[PDB]
Design a protein around this ligand. Sequence first.
Ligand code: M4N
Length: 155
Amino acid sequence: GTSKLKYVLQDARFFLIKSNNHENVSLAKAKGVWSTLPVNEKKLNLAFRSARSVILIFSVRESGKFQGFARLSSESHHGPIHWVLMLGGVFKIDWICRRELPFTKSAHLTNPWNEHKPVKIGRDGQEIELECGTQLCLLFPPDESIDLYQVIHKM
Ligand SMILES: CNC(=O)c1cc(-c2ccccc2)n[nH]1
């Protein structure tokens, strides 16, 4: 069902993450980590202290799809990850959904924080307004491999 997912997303903040390649998203799914540009890293650190959940929604450039979404479990930290290419700050993340969602299925959602353009459109780090981001996450196929119980107990 969707009740625990709705609880995790309650009063959350949402950010679009754009990766150059599938390899980095695959590494993030295997290792529970993400790194981003310093300008975006500053935004995510601020948001992490500010909200009960910060959700990253991932899209590989040119894929026409989102590849899943995850919750920050830490601010960025330094001191290695073989990313394909700065990306030195490393966030810990808990995956909420590792399934894909094609952009065709989100064509009815627009992001007020990006001029009400379709939510698929935006730069890496673009914030997605609460209602848009919640509805986007709810569109993904349920990921039955994930138990949100341990996620809820970090909030
Ligand atoms: C592991 N992190 C990444 O692969 C990544 C790449 C980017 C980016 C942002 C703007 C222009 C080009 C690439 N952001 N995150």
